[PDB]
């Protein structure tokens, strides 16, 4: 397809809306030039969704507790409100960790206040200091809890941060209040940063005036790996075999004690910039510690990252970079051979979060296939900024797509493989579009790093290639 | 590292030498770990009696629930009408959950829209949000009607719906004669199956509360039908199969078996079947109306007795052998319409079955949970089995319910060992489960993580899960079964009876040590 | 000793400590068995390759076979007809094997006569046991045909089966028109499939041989539909269901699923539904006749075209979605009915199953055996999943069936590491998935001894055992399901992707080990 | 029911037959009377079959390969002829035994010669040599080979003894050749015979020069207990804790060496005297072994039977004989206090093969319950000799009893349970009647000794008092 006619595509979907939805819309669509670098002027984002058009994005709340606070492993937290946010977000997210649960690791458990109209009508407050009572005398070895704030809790008007700070100190336990009601912001990245800033304000400065743990030159922090598979795990490996010193994971894998001393390394690693940028800013300017941009999707992003970190220190550790580049240089090579040949000339669409849109496209290059479409839930023009010059030319951009807008943008550009999220997985299956989940990575990982890498390609082969596609019409229609 | 024809993924990738190490050393070095004697020494304490009468003792902390919240009810509930499309009043969050949860169910798109209230509705309210939210959702998705629930924040701030949806009339956004029928559904009171509930009679009154005048029960020589809260495809499949059978004329109202089945045959079907709006309109006119599910439609109860003058017959869910019997001959004294002779065979099978595995099943001990209709019918399933449910346990049951189920088990030998625990979640029952050890568990996926706790005390201690209810998430496919009538009191008999076989052939595996019981011949 | 409240049977009772201590003076008083050291040494030896290849070059030994002997299909085969008493001309203690053998499987009554000849019959032949056992048998339980088949005795000492019922007809020990079809079925020659055919064929020639003069292809407006030797009753029911969907007339010969169903009301049917005299006799009337197990009805068809005149399609066993579709297309070809649209919508409903759980399914490896229609249909829908077939077994297969499978792994990329393998026996088996281990095997009960050696190497050389074929004595009520069609490809897959997740859950329910893959969602 | 009313009972039944099978069933039925103890005046047995009319009796292949043989474990049974017969009967019989099956046992295994057509006419003994050598090289820990021979055999004139003898000398090893060909005899009862003419022959009399096994005067051997369910091992216990040495089981769980250990024993303890009794005769005269018969069905029968071994040794083992009982007195004493008030006064109708249809009369009668009618498949008049002084006056026997026979009793007598075998299962069930197998124990057992009484009471009454018997009527019906 030429510019004029993706720009044609994109005029003839945006008939069938009213018109105000019409003239919002026009400005989340776009045909990208990889030459601009504001891309504000040709994409809006990070704006409210238009009410009933089947939005994919989630809330506040999903992007504090799904996303930031609930991975880290040794704290509780509560989902505070009625029951439904704590149990649709009950163990959805593939977030890994190595613990024991139920005793001293909590991830995957739904604790909330599950409130009833009594607690509508009266506060929350009482039974918030009473559940954290309950909460201690249970699970003994619980290292803090935070206070993840549902719909209600703001509306009502409750005061969860005097709660956290009287039985905070009464209990010697740090309780984290998080103003994340999914009435705020207009997407799951307002989430990212309320969450930001309660790990800010209550739990990064208590090591402040510690000077206890002895520091190297080489200590790291990986910032915004959410162990997805396995995904910190695979990436942590690699960055100590270059012989740094990974002193904490954000938060995949995390614990209190880990976010704590990050303060202490000498540099962040920042994968997610959507969700952890702002606490790496606040660290540079509070700690000066520098954090740098990276990318571990596919081998040629993760031998850049490999090379740009290394050159961040000294010789031995861009020594010891080439020794792990060497290394692993026949596996991925070898899994080029194997699955490249079966991908080579494939197109996929991608709709994600707000990183993985731009962030996977360069290890789909290095298996042979052309990302023709990609799209944020909830990205910024900060994170386009950094999308147009890694897509070609002439592709489709669209920011909080709607279901209707996906699904034609689809019949029309007819990929051959589509990455994105649960709902709109069976969508495109009934159509015959072989989809991959670019959330959960359908229930596979790791996709990070050299070991990643030939999962990816694998999935990738397994479901574009599959005997099921050539099926769908019956030999008698 | 990855050898490239035998990928290994996160398991067992893992567990290679390096990255175990690399994983010690992440503990020993940053984690602050408790001791392992120490976690050891915790763990060995949640199982104890001490420890459960601490976790009954709980007033404000729940965890791990068993419930959902009501608007996930009401979707469930306007999926099942023809073209509609389910619309949430309030934030869009909540609707992200509800087609995830159920998207990973049933396997199938979930189609349902928000109209994003934000922090701006919450100081003004969310009038505007339903005016443009109902527009853009008729032009774009096209639906024939508009089934409008709410989240909790329109609930706490107080929206009124009907004035909001009647200005959007009065205003054009949408045109007079559209149906747009409404609910309240606030998360905080009941749970998923009150939203159903609520959801249903708010359909129900949009058709008919107004046109009563010219309506005449038996006029239309149907049964109504309503099904509740369900989530087995099956369950709306084998009452449609009986009814059938019989030559009985009825009206399925909500009735969503063929929109979460479309064929993959190339086209996406946002719509497909469901109750038709004709069907709601004309349902005064039956003979009477059965419920299905009576312990949570206690409110459209209210309305059909009430409104429609039907004499709703006290009916308990058409589960296991009994109450399958009393479903039809209520069913057959309504319409005049006698039971087939296909009925009666496929009942004398299902007795078949259960005097072929009888030895097995007697005396089996299970703990189980769900929503209160299923629980009680698979508690009377099980009494008729002779098994004796021991933990019985339902987080959103009421005491006039528990009553009823604890006369149920009074009638019986098999219930001496019964408990019935309502608003109790399911961390009180992985108590339960250690202190008083069951066979089995019969519950939704959420077990699976009692399963674990259990064997990490020790393997005789384990107690494994049979995957009966709602949601199913770590297997394919299950939710095409059947648990209603004989044809469902078949499958979940032949479940249990091979489950049990199935774990004896695990514990008689051990050659020299346990496999003279590995019998070939069951 | 026993505790009275909690009686132990065999298992876990001889783990009592007193019996352990006197199980071990047992062995070390008087059992002179081998070391310990000794055993492991050669239990590790028949794991190994070397082993293997001693294994294959057996001439003249057999261990655990995969098939039984011929009266047993004509017996199954007799069953299947209208007021029809299996008759075994020969031994009684196969008769008392047969009926033992399917009780087991069926979990039914099975009834089934011999004549009881004994030693004197070896120098004297049996025409004395056959004339007095007709008459018996006739006069006792009063069937309206008697289906005479043979043990190997009577076949050695050579009984001319026509001459003794001739010549009991003619002596008035029956009656000259009760029918009496009969085969010769030698034990020593293929294997059960054989004897089903013999029978059929002999039952198809009885009633249609000699009154050809007036018969007229087509004039019924029928097809003819022929099972072959078949346990699942799901898979009578399903073609049924299909061919009364579509609207097609058939006849169905040879069928038993309503006397291996019969209800348990309080009465014992000896004799229910089954196929008439007057369709066998009206068959050649039919438009053709479809073999539904072409692989062991070639005397069926060897009839049914040189003497019926039918154009017997060249159609596979209707498993999987391309043979399911093939079926109904020739049907449809020969009947003039078109495929109804709910039929297409079942098939798009099968598709989307494929679609829902291919990336569970991919690339897994499987051993299997069986017969061999159902051997190759199991390959072919694999195949169509994305699953490696690896070790193929059909003992009672031959050359030209092995090169038929050959052609159609050689058709797809799946089948790039599968060997098919006949006459070979379940020991054979068992050194292939020590040496080129696959994931999962499926088999029938016999399977459950090659799962129990693999996990005594280890837990990581354990294969676990699927349970679809023929016989299943160790599960309850497996023999009410399906294979065939769009509802058994759908069972099929939800079976294997759901045992793929089960064994995933065990290698991962290990905590702080390898939970972290223990997902809710899959 | 009087002995009027069972007579005419017998008469109206009879009326189906034709005349000579009428003639000839009349002889296999009667009506008790506790007084007789010449049998054979009040009913024949052991006799033919009469054609047609569906008997339960197996072969004597059955009672030889399935019965005697097959559960010796250390052995390799080759089923030979064709494929049906071993696979019948492989793993039905619940034989239990100790072992690495595969390895150094052999019971649920299925080894056969699988006849062809080109074997039956050239004959199979030159397969047979050739198996053996596979046997050996395959199975390398067998100490010992049995030829099962199946109907073809001996008619076509194989010489399977020579095989035995040449291929026996050659590999130094055991094979024993077993004429037990399902055409001879009438039922499996002959098979008992050649079997234990087979041992008699080829195994038993080989440590006859060797005295290097240390003897005791306690020293017995279970004769005729092949351990269904482990009845063998619930009854060893009771005879070791009451002093004794038992050296051998025959043969269920039983080593070829302990067999050929037996002619070492002071006393042989005969359980199953059909099927055993004949190497207990052939014991007795060669090397002067008494023998006696006893019973371990139910407390009152186990205790007399305690109490009757012990009073054939010394002072001490009686006293150890009366502190077993004492040990065991509160054990059934509580299966007594909780099952007789669930099964007093309840009828039972059993029909099993040619010891139990008379040894487990005391065990139902120690739970209150009353034998109405009882019968062999193959039993001799010594056998029934035994039984009628067991059985109430006036109950209803039967010797080889017919399909049709069996249901018009049950018809007209209507039992509370009955007790059979598979082939019976599954008919009375239909007819709502309570059944348990009395063969394999319905997958659950043991029975013999104390352990077994509760397990056998726990079954009685769950499938008798079972919820599922009250529901075979429709409610509209
Ligand atoms: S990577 Fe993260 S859960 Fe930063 S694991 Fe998750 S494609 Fe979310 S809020 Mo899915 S930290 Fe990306 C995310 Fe955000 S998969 Fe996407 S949408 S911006
Ligand atoms: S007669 Fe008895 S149940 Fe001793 S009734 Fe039964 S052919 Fe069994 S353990 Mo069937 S006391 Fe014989 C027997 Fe043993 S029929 Fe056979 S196998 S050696
Ligand atoms: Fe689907
Ligand atoms: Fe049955």
Known sequence: ?????????????????????????????????????????????????????????????????????????????????????????????????????????????????????????????????????????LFPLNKGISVQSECPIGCIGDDIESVSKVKGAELSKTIVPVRCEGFRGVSQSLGHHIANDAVRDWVLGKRDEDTTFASTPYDVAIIGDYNIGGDAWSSRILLEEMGLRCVAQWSGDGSISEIELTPKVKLNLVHCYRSMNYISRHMEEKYGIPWMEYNFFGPTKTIESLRAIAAKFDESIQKKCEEVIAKYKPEWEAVVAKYRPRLEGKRVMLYIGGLRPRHVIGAYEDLGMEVVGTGYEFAHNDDYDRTMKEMGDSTLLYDDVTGYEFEEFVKRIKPDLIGSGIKEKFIFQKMGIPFRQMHSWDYSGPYHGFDGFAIFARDMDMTLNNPCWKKLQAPWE | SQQVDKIKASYPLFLDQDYKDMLAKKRDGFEEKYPQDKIDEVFQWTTTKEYQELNFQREALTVNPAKACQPLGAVLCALGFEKTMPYVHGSQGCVAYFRSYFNRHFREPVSCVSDSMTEDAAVFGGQQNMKDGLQNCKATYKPDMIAVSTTCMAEVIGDDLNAFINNSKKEGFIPDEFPVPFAHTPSFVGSHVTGWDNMFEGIARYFTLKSMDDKVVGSNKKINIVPGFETYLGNFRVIKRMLSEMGVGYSLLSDPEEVLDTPADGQFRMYAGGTTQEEMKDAPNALNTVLLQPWHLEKTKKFVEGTWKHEVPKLNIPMGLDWTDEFLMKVSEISGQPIPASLTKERGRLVDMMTDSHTWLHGKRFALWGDPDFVMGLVKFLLELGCEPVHILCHNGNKRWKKAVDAILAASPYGKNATVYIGKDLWHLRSLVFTDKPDFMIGNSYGKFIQRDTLHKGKEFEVPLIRIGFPIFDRHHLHRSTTLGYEGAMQILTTLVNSILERLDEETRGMQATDYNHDLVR
């Open chain 1, 1 to 137: 397809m030429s510019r004029e006619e993706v720009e044609s595509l994109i005029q003839e979907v945006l008939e069938v809306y009213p018109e105000k939805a019409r003239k919002d819309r026009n400005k989340h669509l776009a045909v990208n030039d990889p030459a601009v670098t504001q891309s504000k002027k040709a994409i809006i984002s990070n704006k409210k969704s238009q009410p009933g058009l089947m939005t994919i994005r989630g809330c506040a709340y999903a992007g504090s507790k799904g996303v930031v606070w609930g991975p880290i492993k040794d704290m509780i937290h509560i989902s505070h409100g009625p029951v439904g946010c704590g149990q649709y977000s009950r163990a959805g997210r593939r977030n890994y960790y190595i613990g024991t649960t139920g005793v001293n690791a909590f991830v995957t458990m739904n604790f909330t206040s599950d409130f009833q109209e009594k607690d509508i009508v009266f506060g929350g407050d009482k039974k918030l200091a009473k559940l954290i009572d309950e909460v201690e005398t």
